[PDB]
């Protein structure tokens, strides 16, 4: 029975995790900087607190742009790699499964503080096969070096090939009417990254590798993602993101969610989210291919009554994930404000809770971990909070 295989068990072993967001991914004027977006430097204590809270995994998005020497070698500045190495091993010290990647290098929108510097350019790769070739060489050289640095680190360290690749229009643009050209290239980049990771030798030969689809959208993934040919069986996982529905979870234009909410995104609640998880479960988990959410979340609310809807959202979706053998990592950017972009629940320097962050963390983790067979989507649903409208 493929859903009962070792790879899906490894997928589930990541449980509910946490992103060191706006940290090694932060960047401006063409260069990443750990503190560049207001977060202070991570410490062992950061990761200790994560393990203590019950997270099983941690994702350290890294933006490499600015620390890459010239072609043809694309040498990564050693200090930058040292710091990545160092963090990965702090996480290992705390008993966490660890994910690293190529992050804002691939940022595909126009709203960037590093305009002109995103070498990982999907429109430009589609535009010409020559520029597609340069990008592939750079992806190769970068993954070879990362692989070589971590050759003695085992399957507790996961590599995620790319982040959220796109053309600016978030999966509503030319990708829907170019005859699959954008999707074909992205699949080719994943292939090239997997090739390079495996060629790094050592424990990279049997390391789990996460591969995304277009803009990390679950549906565009199930429709167009082609899993790369691999040198070993059962060592690829599908990476997806979800902040659905965005205007509730991300922008906080609406502040309630689900069947008991009144201030809701219209017609988009419990059924839609589980439908999305079911398509992933039928496409991948049922076929022995693990899926994880590299990023999921909902921002913090100003009122206690709206916050209860946030906890409800977490309890419900995280249970639905558990039951579909899907693991997931919460997006934490360190920002303690409420509303738009207010994702911070754990301090990035100390690993202590920010504001009421503990309730959210407990909500997502406990719901996923719960092994009481009476605790179901029905019971969670029936205890949805009361609308304050
Ligand atoms: O605060 C200073 C800088 O913030 C930058 O915005 C970032 C958000 O604060 C962050 O939460 C968001 O996270 C992304 C994630 O990186 C991505 O993989 C996924 O697709 O969506 C998440 C949630 O949107 O990233 C943005 C930037 O990409 C500003 O860009 C910057 O100008 C500002 O100084």
Residue numbers in the entry: 9 to 397
Manuscript text:
AC2aCel5A is an endo-acting cellulase that is encoded within the first reported cellulolytic PUL, originating from an uncultured Bacteroidetes phylotype. As previously reported, AC2aCel5A is an endoglucanase active on β-(1,4) glycosidic bonds between glucose units in soluble and insoluble cellulosic substrates and in linear β-glucans. The enzyme displays the typical (β/α)8 barrel structure associated with the GH5 family. The six closest structural homologues, which include all the biochemically characterized members of subfamily GH5_4, were identified using the Dali server and were used to produce a structure-based multiple sequence alignment using the PROMALS3D server. This allowed identification of the conserved catalytic residues, i.e. Glu172 and Glu303, acting as the catalytic acid and nucleophile/base, respectively.
The roles of Glu172 and Glu303 as catalytic residues were confirmed by site-directed mutagenesis experiments, showing that AC2aCel5A_EE172A and AC2aCel5A_EE303A were both inactive in the standard carboxymethylcellulose (CMC) assay. Co-crystallization of the E172A mutant with cellotetraose resulted in the complex structure solved to 2.4 Å resolution, with two molecules in the asymmetric unit. Additional electron density was observed in the active-site cleft of molecule A, and was refined as a cellotriose molecule bound to the −3 to −1 subsites. No electron-density for a bound ligand could be observed in the B molecule, which also lacked electron density for several main-chain residues, namely 34–45 and 112–127. Even though the ligand density appears to fit a cellotriose molecule, it is likely that a cellotetraose molecule is present in the complex as the enzyme only produces dimers from cellotetraose. The observed cellotriose density could reflect three glucose moieties of a tetramer, where the fourth moiety could be positioned in the putative −4 position and be disordered. The glucose moiety bound in the −1 subsite is stabilized by hydrogen bonding from its O2 group to the catalytic Glu303 residue, as well as the strictly conserved Asn171. Unlike the sugars bound in the −2 and −1 subsites, the sugar bound in the −3 subsite involves no hydrogen bonds between the ligand and the protein. Its binding seems to be mediated by stacking interactions with Trp45. Superposition of the native structure on the cellotriose complex placed a carboxyl oxygen of the catalytic acid, Glu172, at 1.7 Å of O1 of the glucose bound in the −1 subsite.
